[PDB]
Amino acid sequence: QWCQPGYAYNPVLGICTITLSR
């Protein structure tokens, strides 16, 4: 359960997804 920078951990999906917070 580790997400690379620029990605936010998603518990619903169970995987890391990209995010821009904008």
PDB file of N, CA, C and O in Angstrom:
ATOM      1  N   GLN A   1       0.831  -1.198   0.000  1.00  0.00           N
ATOM      2  CA  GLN A   1       0.000   0.000   0.000  1.00  0.00           C
ATOM      3  C   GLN A   1       0.870   1.253   0.000  1.00  0.00           C
ATOM      4  O   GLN A   1       0.966   1.954   1.008  1.00  0.00           O
ATOM      5  N   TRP A   2       1.502   1.526  -1.137  1.00  0.00           N
ATOM      6  CA  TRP A   2       2.366   2.694  -1.264  1.00  0.00           C
ATOM      7  C   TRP A   2       2.091   3.416  -2.578  1.00  0.00           C
ATOM      8  O   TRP A   2       2.076   2.799  -3.644  1.00  0.00           O
ATOM      9  N   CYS A   3       1.871   4.726  -2.494  1.00  0.00           N
ATOM     10  CA  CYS A   3       1.591   5.527  -3.681  1.00  0.00           C
ATOM     11  C   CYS A   3       2.752   6.474  -3.974  1.00  0.00           C
ATOM     12  O   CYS A   3       3.261   7.144  -3.076  1.00  0.00           O
ATOM     13  N   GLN A   4       3.161   6.526  -5.237  1.00  0.00           N
ATOM     14  CA  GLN A   4       4.261   7.396  -5.643  1.00  0.00           C
ATOM     15  C   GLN A   4       3.819   8.867  -5.609  1.00  0.00           C
ATOM     16  O   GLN A   4       2.624   9.144  -5.657  1.00  0.00           O
ATOM     17  N   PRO A   5       4.727   9.820  -5.530  1.00  0.00           N
ATOM     18  CA  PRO A   5       4.336  11.266  -5.501  1.00  0.00           C
ATOM     19  C   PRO A   5       3.410  11.627  -6.661  1.00  0.00           C
ATOM     20  O   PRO A   5       3.593  11.158  -7.784  1.00  0.00           O
ATOM     21  N   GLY A   6       2.413  12.458  -6.376  1.00  0.00           N
ATOM     22  CA  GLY A   6       1.456  12.871  -7.395  1.00  0.00           C
ATOM     23  C   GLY A   6       0.248  11.940  -7.416  1.00  0.00           C
ATOM     24  O   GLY A   6      -0.739  12.203  -8.102  1.00  0.00           O
ATOM     25  N   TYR A   7       0.336  10.852  -6.652  1.00  0.00           N
ATOM     26  CA  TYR A   7      -0.751   9.881  -6.575  1.00  0.00           C
ATOM     27  C   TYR A   7      -1.280   9.781  -5.149  1.00  0.00           C
ATOM     28  O   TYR A   7      -0.511   9.822  -4.188  1.00  0.00           O
ATOM     29  N   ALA A   8      -2.596   9.645  -5.024  1.00  0.00           N
ATOM     30  CA  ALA A   8      -3.229   9.535  -3.714  1.00  0.00           C
ATOM     31  C   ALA A   8      -3.824   8.143  -3.532  1.00  0.00           C
ATOM     32  O   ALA A   8      -4.502   7.626  -4.419  1.00  0.00           O
ATOM     33  N   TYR A   9      -3.558   7.539  -2.379  1.00  0.00           N
ATOM     34  CA  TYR A   9      -4.068   6.203  -2.098  1.00  0.00           C
ATOM     35  C   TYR A   9      -5.589   6.198  -2.045  1.00  0.00           C
ATOM     36  O   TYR A   9      -6.199   7.023  -1.363  1.00  0.00           O
ATOM     37  N   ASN A  10      -6.191   5.249  -2.754  1.00  0.00           N
ATOM     38  CA  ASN A  10      -7.641   5.121  -2.771  1.00  0.00           C
ATOM     39  C   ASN A  10      -8.061   3.833  -2.054  1.00  0.00           C
ATOM     40  O   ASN A  10      -7.769   2.742  -2.543  1.00  0.00           O
ATOM     41  N   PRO A  11      -8.724   3.912  -0.921  1.00  0.00           N
ATOM     42  CA  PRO A  11      -9.145   2.689  -0.188  1.00  0.00           C
ATOM     43  C   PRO A  11     -10.306   1.991  -0.887  1.00  0.00           C
ATOM     44  O   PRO A  11     -10.421   0.766  -0.852  1.00  0.00           O
ATOM     45  N   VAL A  12     -11.155   2.783  -1.535  1.00  0.00           N
ATOM     46  CA  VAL A  12     -12.293   2.237  -2.260  1.00  0.00           C
ATOM     47  C   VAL A  12     -11.819   1.375  -3.426  1.00  0.00           C
ATOM     48  O   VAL A  12     -12.325   0.273  -3.640  1.00  0.00           O
ATOM     49  N   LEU A  13     -10.849   1.887  -4.179  1.00  0.00           N
ATOM     50  CA  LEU A  13     -10.318   1.157  -5.326  1.00  0.00           C
ATOM     51  C   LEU A  13      -9.266   0.147  -4.873  1.00  0.00           C
ATOM     52  O   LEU A  13      -9.053  -0.877  -5.523  1.00  0.00           O
ATOM     53  N   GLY A  14      -8.612   0.443  -3.752  1.00  0.00           N
ATOM     54  CA  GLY A  14      -7.584  -0.448  -3.218  1.00  0.00           C
ATOM     55  C   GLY A  14      -6.239  -0.220  -3.905  1.00  0.00           C
ATOM     56  O   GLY A  14      -5.268  -0.926  -3.630  1.00  0.00           O
ATOM     57  N   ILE A  15      -6.188   0.765  -4.800  1.00  0.00           N
ATOM     58  CA  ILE A  15      -4.955   1.072  -5.521  1.00  0.00           C
ATOM     59  C   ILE A  15      -4.682   2.575  -5.514  1.00  0.00           C
ATOM     60  O   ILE A  15      -5.512   3.365  -5.062  1.00  0.00           O
ATOM     61  N   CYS A  16      -3.510   2.961  -6.010  1.00  0.00           N
ATOM     62  CA  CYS A  16      -3.138   4.373  -6.052  1.00  0.00           C
ATOM     63  C   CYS A  16      -3.642   5.013  -7.344  1.00  0.00           C
ATOM     64  O   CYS A  16      -3.544   4.416  -8.416  1.00  0.00           O
ATOM     65  N   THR A  17      -4.176   6.229  -7.235  1.00  0.00           N
ATOM     66  CA  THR A  17      -4.683   6.941  -8.407  1.00  0.00           C
ATOM     67  C   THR A  17      -4.074   8.334  -8.489  1.00  0.00           C
ATOM     68  O   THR A  17      -3.667   8.906  -7.479  1.00  0.00           O
ATOM     69  N   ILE A  18      -3.998   8.864  -9.704  1.00  0.00           N
ATOM     70  CA  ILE A  18      -3.417  10.181  -9.916  1.00  0.00           C
ATOM     71  C   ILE A  18      -4.356  11.268  -9.408  1.00  0.00           C
ATOM     72  O   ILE A  18      -5.577  11.104  -9.418  1.00  0.00           O
ATOM     73  N   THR A  19      -3.779  12.378  -8.965  1.00  0.00           N
ATOM     74  CA  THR A  19      -4.570  13.488  -8.455  1.00  0.00           C
ATOM     75  C   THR A  19      -3.853  14.807  -8.717  1.00  0.00           C
ATOM     76  O   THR A  19      -2.624  14.862  -8.732  1.00  0.00           O
ATOM     77  N   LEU A  20      -4.633  15.863  -8.922  1.00  0.00           N
ATOM     78  CA  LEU A  20      -4.071  17.184  -9.187  1.00  0.00           C
ATOM     79  C   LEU A  20      -4.527  18.178  -8.123  1.00  0.00           C
ATOM     80  O   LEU A  20      -3.980  19.276  -8.011  1.00  0.00           O
ATOM     81  N   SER A  21      -5.528  17.785  -7.343  1.00  0.00           N
ATOM     82  CA  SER A  21      -6.050  18.649  -6.290  1.00  0.00           C
ATOM     83  C   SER A  21      -6.435  20.015  -6.850  1.00  0.00           C
ATOM     84  O   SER A  21      -6.201  21.044  -6.220  1.00  0.00           O
ATOM     85  N   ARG A  22      -7.029  20.014  -8.040  1.00  0.00           N
ATOM     86  CA  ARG A  22      -7.445  21.261  -8.674  1.00  0.00           C
ATOM     87  C   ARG A  22      -8.394  20.980  -9.832  1.00  0.00           C
ATOM     88  O   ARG A  22      -7.925  20.911 -10.957  1.00  0.00           O
TER      89      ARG A  22
END
